[model samples]
Target: GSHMNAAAVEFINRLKKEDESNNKCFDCGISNPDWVSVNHGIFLCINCSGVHRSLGVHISIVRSIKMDIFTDEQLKYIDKGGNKKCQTYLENYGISDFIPERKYRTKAADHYRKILRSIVHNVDPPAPLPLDEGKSLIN
Candidate 1:
C-alpha cells in the first residue's frame, strides 16, 4: 500500500540520468539529491528541502522524489526546468545563493517567483521590469 507508482519512479530516475546537475542539490551542491521543489522545478537535498519547507508552500512546494507520488503536471515542471535552467534564472538576477528567507521573502524578490511560476505553468515569462518600476506597477 505504501508503494509509489513504478513508472513515475522510473521516469524520475531517467530524468536524473538525463541531467547530471539533477544528481546534486540545486541549493547546496550535495550529491544524490532526493528531494524536489515542485514550484521551482529544482532538485534538492533533505537539508535544503527543510529550508524550502520553511519558506512555505506559497514560495516553494517540496516533495520527496522517492517517497511522494508525483502527478504528470508536477513531473512536467520538473522535466522542463531542472537545476541548470533554474540556476541560470537565478544567476540572471544576480542571486547566487539560495537562502530561503533572503531569496524568497522580500518584496524585491517577486521577479524570481514570477519566473518560477512561468516555468511551472509552461508559459513565457514577462520580461523582468526594473525593481522600482515593477513595484510601482504592482502597487
Candidate 2:
C-alpha cells in the first residue's frame, strides 16, 4: 500500500520548504514535528496525529514522516497543499462544537478532516468566503 518514489520524496522536500520557517505542527503548534498527514503535507505532532488517525483515512489518512513512503496518486489526492491551504479551510466555517483546547489545538480537526475528505473527493463545490466578513484573518 506504500512505496518510496520520486513524487513522495519531492513532496517531503516541498513540505520542508513550506514549514522551514516555523517547523511546527499545523494542528497544535508543536515544534519540530515528525508526524504528517500524507494526503495534506501538513506537519503534525503525535497527539494531533492520534486524533487524525481516529477519524480514519476518509478524513485524514495519517502517516509517519520519513517512515512510510507516499505514492503519486496520494500526492495528487491532496493537491499537495501545505499549512496555508489546510488552515484556510480548517479555520473557516466557525464551528463551536469542540472544546477550547481542541478548538485552539486541533481546531475541530475532525471537522476539518471531513472538509479535507470532501475537498479531496470532489464531494461538493468549494465553501464560500472565509473571515466572517469583517473580523478577517489578517487582523
Best by lDDT: 1
TM-score of each: 0.79, 0.58
Give the per-residue lDDT digits (tens) of candidate 2, residues 49-108.
888787656456677665666556566544545666666655464533343234433424
Q: lDDT for model 1, please.
A: 0.75
Candidate 1 has which clashing residue pairs, if any? none
Estimate the TM-score for candidate 2. 0.58
Give me the runs in candidate 1 sitting further than 4 Å from their true place. Answer: 1-4, 106-109, 119-124, 131-139
- In TM-score terms, which candidate is top? 1
User: Tens digit of lDDT per residue, candidate 1, span 1-139?
Assistant: 3344787778778888998898999888999998999877889999999999987877788999778888878888787778888777566555556466766554434666576668767689868656443322122
Looking at model 1, which ten-residue stretch has the lowest summed lDDT? Answer: 130-139
